[PDB]
């Protein structure tokens, strides 16, 4: 399981900014914290999946908790954003992007855990493996360098103590909401799969097979070929993965063939393989 | 859930 | 560094036509994070349409899912419409029906 | 005996604008067939069957979708299939802001010294390409230009594009030209 927390905090004015949250679970997009300056009142703390029904019918005040958080964590984010734009300036957008990240087992044991910002689209600082020691920019490749001695000193006063309650919240907290989040979050779900060939050319086709609303997201698709005559230039290929908003993923692919050719296309997800033909003879 | 504790820049 | 996006169409279902779907624009991979997205039918912007909160990849680089409910019939036509800083001028992906 | 493949005005063109596909192979052969490697373009058999055997494949107004790498070919069941043509490689440009040029030590060259030329660009790209105003491939990019000499134009101008969809180029960078030593 990974438990994932990204936070976007836009600088526009010294009276505008923004900072979008989102919480993903294996995944799934299941929380979002937003706040501007401009409003505040107006600041947002909402489940976007269904599964977080169940999860705020179980606690209660689970939305409440976050948002007071978040009203917090914004407060600190506007002193952080005017003052990285003050010292550093920015070179295509004044943002700073951070996230944490909890990696356990089946069973909620911690395995892994991550902290990271980047300026600009710049990594700033992380915290990897133990999570004792915070690395900087990589200055050999980032316009950062053009402040090096200040954010060396940004990184090299970050306390132990400030770093110690950032490294029990992954390996606590973390991977206990990680544990509980797993007890809500959707069984496997198989996805709907569909293929066939088109465009004709000459002897020439192309194959197509793509899946539907799967989760987990990892899936293997092939298209085998029952024969033994096939185009030069051909080579399967697939769109990338991609997200629905109801937390599960598509994907598809393509294939020149000559009409030819006898083809089936194999989806395997899970401990699940389909196999349908796509051109017969 | 979100952490409590935010570090400061 | 500045970051174009990367732009896929696609339906949450196998399309058909007078049956209900939904039709999504996933755009990925940019910076700066402003931009400009709209679902077109028949060359024309979609009103209704939607998108998730912002987020980014392990590069920092941002990305959002554009979407609205559909019914496509045989008549129509559907597309993405992009605009980024990293452009000349928006650019435009149609929908593969089968992908 | 393979067919021939060019496209007129050019392989590389300026989104919007439009460019015919050519092919020839014998005096005698209308049984033309074009195709894009790997994934398929639908254009192709969309061009009226009158102007495929003139070996005749316009498209009236190129898009990112044209873009590819083309290969055709003469034949049929009834008899006759030829070799493939060699590739012809349909760029598109237009699509991204513009790259800059820029001659490494400087513009200005001696007679015989070669140059070094980069092609930088403020949009993450991972390919670029070199063209002479003929291009070569290469966020910014090294290129070496020379002998140089008078009286020969050393006119470029480069291109950034993302190796993933190389055949979709930014808008050119500005006309680099260098001044010989004399
Ligand atoms: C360090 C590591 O494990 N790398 C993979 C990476 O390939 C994948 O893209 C990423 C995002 O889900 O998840 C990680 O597990
Ligand atoms: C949205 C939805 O599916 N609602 C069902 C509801 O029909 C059922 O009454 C309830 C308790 O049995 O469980 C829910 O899952
Ligand atoms: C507990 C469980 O298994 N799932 C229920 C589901 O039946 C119901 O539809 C949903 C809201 O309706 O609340 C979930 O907690
Ligand atoms: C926090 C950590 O250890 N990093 C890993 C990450 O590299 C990997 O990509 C992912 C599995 O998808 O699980 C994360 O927890
Ligand atoms: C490393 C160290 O001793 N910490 C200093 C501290 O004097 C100061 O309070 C803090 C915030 O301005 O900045 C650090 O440089
Ligand atoms: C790591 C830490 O500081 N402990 C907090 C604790 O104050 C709080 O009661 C609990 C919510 O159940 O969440 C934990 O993260
Ligand atoms: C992908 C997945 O679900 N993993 C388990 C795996 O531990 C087990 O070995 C397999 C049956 O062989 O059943 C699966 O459910
Ligand atoms: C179990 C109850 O019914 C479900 O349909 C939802 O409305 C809520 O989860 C509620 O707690």
């Known amino acids: 399981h990974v438990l994932r927390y990204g936070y976007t905090g836009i600088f526009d004015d010294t009276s505008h900014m923004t900072l979008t949250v989102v919480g993903i679970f294996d995944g799934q997009h299941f929380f979002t914290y937003h706040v501007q300056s401009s409003d505040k009142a107006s600041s947002r703390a909402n489940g976007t999946i269904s599964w977080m029904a169940n999860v705020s019918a179980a606690y209660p005040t ?9 009203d917090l964590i914004f407060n ?3 002193q952080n954003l005017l003052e990285l734009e003050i010292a550093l300036g920015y070179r295509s957008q004044s943002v700073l992007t951070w996230t944490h990240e909890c990696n356990t087992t089946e069973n909620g044991s911690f395995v892994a855990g991550y902290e990271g910002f980047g300026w600009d689209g710049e990594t700033l600082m992380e915290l990897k493996d133990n999570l004792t020691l915070w690395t900087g920019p990589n200055y050999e490749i980032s316009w950062l360098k053009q402040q090096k001695t200040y954010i060396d000193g940004k990184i090299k006063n970050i306390s132990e103590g400030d770093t110690t309650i950032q490294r029990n919240y992954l390996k606590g907290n973390c991977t206990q909401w990680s544990v509980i989040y797993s007890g809500f979050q959707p069984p496997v779900t198989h996805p709907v799969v569909k293929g066939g060939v088109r465009n004709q050319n000459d002897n020439r086709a192309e194959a197509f ?20 005559k096939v185009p030069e230039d051909s080579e399967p290929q697939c769109n990338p993965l991609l997200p629905t908003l109801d937390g599960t993923f598509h994907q598809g692919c393509y294939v020149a063939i000559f009409s030819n050719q006898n083809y089936t296309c194999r989806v395997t997800h899970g401990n699940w393989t389909v196999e349908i033909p796509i051109s017969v003879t | 859930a979100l952490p409590h504790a935010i570090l400061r820049l | 560094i500045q970051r174009t ?9 196998p399309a058909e036509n007078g049956k209900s779907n939904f039709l999504n624009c996933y755009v990925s991979g940019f910076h700066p994070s402003d931009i400009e997205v709209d679902l077109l039918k028949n060359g024309e912007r979609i009103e209704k349409v939607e998108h998730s909160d912002l987020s980014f990849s392990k590069d920092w680089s941002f990305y959002l899912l554009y979407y609205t409910e559909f019914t496509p019939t045989e008549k129509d036509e559907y597309a993405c419409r992009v605009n980024h800083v990293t452009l000349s001028q928006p650019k435009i992906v149609k929908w593969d029906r089968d992908m | 005996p393979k067919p021939t493949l060019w496209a007129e005005p050019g392989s590389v063109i300026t989104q919007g604008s439009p460019v015919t596909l050519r092919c020839q192979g014998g005096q005698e052969t209308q049984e033309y067939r074009l195709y894009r490697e790997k994934k398929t373009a639908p254009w192709i058999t969309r061009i009226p069957q009158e102007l495929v055997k003139k070996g005749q494949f316009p498209i009236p107004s190129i898009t990112w979708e044209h873009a590819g790498r083309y290969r055709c070919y003469y034949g049929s069941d009834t008899a006759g299939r030829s070799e493939s043509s060699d590739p012809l490689e349909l760029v598109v440009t237009g699509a991204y802001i513009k790259p800059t040029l820029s001659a490494q030590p400087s513009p200005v060259v001696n007679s015989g010294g070669n140059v070094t030329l980069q092609c930088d660009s403020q949009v993450a790209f991972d ?4 063209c002479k105003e003929q291009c ?19 006119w470029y101008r480069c291109y950034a594009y993302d190796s993933n969809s190389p055949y979709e180029w930014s808008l050119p960078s500005d006309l680099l030209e260098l001044l010989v030593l004399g």
């Open chain 1, 62 to 70: 689970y939305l409440d908790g976050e948002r007071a958080k978040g």
């Open chain 1, 76 to 78: 600190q984010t506007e």
């Open chain 1, 209 to 228: 097979c793509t899946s539907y609303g799967f989760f987990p997201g990892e899936i293997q698709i092939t298209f085998i070929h029952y024969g033994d």
């Open chain 3, 5 to 13: 996006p990367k732009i896929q169409v696609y339906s949450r279902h």
């Open chain 4, 127 to 130: 390919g670029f390409i070199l």
């Open chain 4, 136 to 154: 070569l491939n290469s966020s910014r990019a090294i290129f070496s230009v020379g002998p140089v000499s008078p009286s020969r134009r050393w």
